[PDB]
Swiss-Prot record:
Residue ranges occupied by any Macro domain in the UniProt entry: 4-163
Protein name, UniProt field: Non-structural protein 3
Covered residues, full protein: 1334 to 1493 of 2474
Known outcome of mutating residue 36 to A: Partial loss of mono-ADP-ribosylhydrolase activity
Subcellular location: Host cytoplasmic vesicle membrane
């Protein structure tokens, strides 16, 4: 575990993380995909061997010794707000189990279902709160990756509010 487990946020490409493992915002079919998923495919293509997994689950595939945790959030275009919220929470619980199993001291994580799976809505708070619910009981240093300047400020404020 980390000596003083923490949350941090960084505004940069998650493919350039400084953590011991990465969470991919995957699609269920293990395809190269869009956004975070395509950056992860370019950096760790070997990790897409048999990476397909259902919505609400996470599947880890090693690239060398570096773990890629493929976490499948729901596409809110297809799911109801109610069912989507349940699957989004479940995906993060499966990420916490994998991070714990791997014994890493740090993990790089994106906000699941906030990009092309958002159904055209702002889901920063919804996704971040499900991340906290899952990860608060783990002792890994968690570094949350985003790309938007106002998202960085809102994520930073949410972390500091609890400290
Ligand atoms: C924090 O998000 C990313 O790491 C990211 C990488 C590549 C993209 O095209 C989009 C987002
Ligand atoms: N998760 C995330 N980081 N930056 C952005 C920007 C728009 C929508 C989602 N985002
Ligand atoms: Cl960058
Ligand atoms: Cl997304």
């Amino acid at each position: 575990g980390a000596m003083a487990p923490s949350y941090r946020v960084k505004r940069m490409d998650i493919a350039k993380n400084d953590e011991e493992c990465v969470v991919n915002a995957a699609n269920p079919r293990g395809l190269p995909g869009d956004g975070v998923c395509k950056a992860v495919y370019k950096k760790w293509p070997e990790s897409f061997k048999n990476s397909a997994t259902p919505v609400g689950t996470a599947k880890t595939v090693m690239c060398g010794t570096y773990p890629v945790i493929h976490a499948v959030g729901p596409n809110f275009s297809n799911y109801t707000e109610s069912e989507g919220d349940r699957e989004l929470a479940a995906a993060y619980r499966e990420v916490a189990k994998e991070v714990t199993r791997l014994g890493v001291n740090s993990v790089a994580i994106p906000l699941l279902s906030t990009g092309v799976y958002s159904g055209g809505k702002d889901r920063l708070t919804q996704s971040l709160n499900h991340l906290f619910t899952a990860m608060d009981s783990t002792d890994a240093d968690v570094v949350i990756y985003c790309r938007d300047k106002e998202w960085e400020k809102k994520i930073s404020e949410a972390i500091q509010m609890r400290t």
